[PDB]
Structures are given as structure tokens and as C-alpha cells.
Design a protein around this nucleic acid. Sequence first.
DNA 1: AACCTGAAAATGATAGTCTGCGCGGCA
DNA 2: TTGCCGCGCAGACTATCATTTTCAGGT
DNA 3: AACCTGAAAATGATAGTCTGCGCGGCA
DNA 4: TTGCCGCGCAGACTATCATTTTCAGGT
Lengths: 90, 94
Amino acid sequence: NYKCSFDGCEKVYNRPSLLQQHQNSHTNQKPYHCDEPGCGKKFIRPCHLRVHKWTHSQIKPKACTLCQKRFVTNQQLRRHLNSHERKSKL
Amino acid sequence: NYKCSFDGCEKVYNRPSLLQQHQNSHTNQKPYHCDEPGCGKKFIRPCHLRVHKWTHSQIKPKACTLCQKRFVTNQQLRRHLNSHERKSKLASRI
DNA sequence: AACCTGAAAATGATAGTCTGCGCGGCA
DNA sequence: TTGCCGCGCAGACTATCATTTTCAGGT
DNA sequence: AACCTGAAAATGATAGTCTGCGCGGCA
DNA sequence: TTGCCGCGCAGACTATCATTTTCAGGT
Ligand SMILES: [Zn+2]
Ligand SMILES: [Zn+2]
Ligand SMILES: [Zn+2]
Ligand SMILES: [Zn+2]
Ligand SMILES: [Zn+2]
Ligand SMILES: [Zn+2]
């Protein structure tokens, strides 16, 4: 496997990529750049950037059947629907 | 909560003791010493020493139902019983 | 009331971890 | 031709925290 | 064969992390 | 007495590596 050389970490990952992404956390390195005009945000991991890029699309992917609002994560949508339900109850 | 001030660490623990024990990693400190004649081993955490002290005690805690041998960790005993099972099965197939 | 005010909830963005896939390399 | 393995990839989750919006209390 | 010999397995010790408990301090 | 909150401990775990013992290979 692959272990972290950091002073007191002692973490282990089963892939080189995972170790490099973990180590970028100690070195505050964010290889994955948003190629979007005006953003210049950077991220440790490719998933983080794949998700960030949705903030720029005019129409966000996940939709609310009720209020037509749109969202990015599933968790965003579920939290929003639980707010709708808690609101109905009141 | 409790965060590590060390550069680029970014660990977090929910108790002072936990933070202090992590910080023993940076300072290479082993506060908890074995008070046993001739041992003089040292440890980062109190649990590590609580576990070590069993090596000196006359009766180890975990026992084997089969061969009566005794052990320290549960993992030790689980592994030993799986050795018993592998051997019993292999000779039973034979 | 029509106010404010800070608390409470919603919303938004982003960090780590886990699963399962395909794809090349190896034997 | 094989599968067998190491590996990166893509997407999911939870958790965290900041930023906004709502909300209730007192005034 | 009964050898050795190195591989594989057993065994032992020790690092970090997670959960649940009781325990004291308060308000 | 309520709990509510911090807090350290104990038990449990995973994982790693060192040290011993077992076990087949060729001889
Ligand atoms: Zn690390
Ligand atoms: Zn961007
Ligand atoms: Zn909605
Ligand atoms: Zn640290
Ligand atoms: Zn000792
Ligand atoms: Zn036994």
C-alpha cells in the first residue's frame, strides 16, 4: 500500500492518486483549476472541481418538483424538500 | 473543537487529551512509561500502555477454548482460532 | 402593529471517504 | 486468448462551514 | 530418509481511531 | 434533583511490522 510521510499522519491509501491528493492537503496544493472566466478557484480533487463547475451553468442539474428551484448536490435537494415538508407540517 | 496548530496538519479532535496525544507525534514524546523492572518501555497513549502491561502479568486476559493458551488482544485470539479452524478443516478434508 | 434584533433555518459551496467500472499491463 | 492485477476515473454519500433568508421575540 | 533451507503461517507487539460509559461540574 | 455539557477511560477495532514457528521444496 501507500502511507503518508507527514510527521504525525500515519494514514494509508490503496492507490498512488489517493496518497497524492491527501498529501496536497498538507502542502495546501490545489492542482485542479476551474477553467471558468473569473472563477480561478482551485481544488485538491477532481470530483470537487467537477462539482464546482455546476455553479457556473445557468440551469443547475437537479430539480424540485414543487417550487421549480434547481440544485447541484442530491443533499441540497433533499434538504430543500425536508424544509418544504417541515413547512407543510407547520 | 480542538485543532492541531502544527503546520499543514489540519487534524481535529473533540477532546484535549486526544489533541495532546496526537501532538506527541510531532514532538516524538512518549509520556506513559512502563513501571516494570527491566522494561522501561514508553508509549504515546495510556491505552497503549494499558495493553502493554499485560505482557508482564502472569495470566493474560483472552483465552483459547481449545488449547487453553492465553492472549492479550481480541485480534490475537481471533487469528489464533482461525488458524485452528483452517488446520481442522484441512485435515478433515484429508 | 411597523419596528427592529439576534436566533433559527434554509441555502450554497466544498472538503473526505467509499464503491464499482473499465482499461491497459502482466503472466 | 486469457483472466488477474494496479490503477485512475466517475459518482455517490456525509460532514462541515459560510452566506442568505426566514422567523420569532420584544418594542 | 532425514536433510537442510527459505517460504509461509503463526504469533506478538504497537500504532491510530471509534463508541459508549460514567463522572464531575454547573445552571 | 433535573438534565446538559465536557471530559477521560475502557473496550473494541483495524492495520502494520517484527519475531517465531511451522511447513513444503529440492536434495
Ligand atoms: Zn498525511
Ligand atoms: Zn469556477
Ligand atoms: Zn422546492
Ligand atoms: Zn498535528
Ligand atoms: Zn513493560
Ligand atoms: Zn488454541
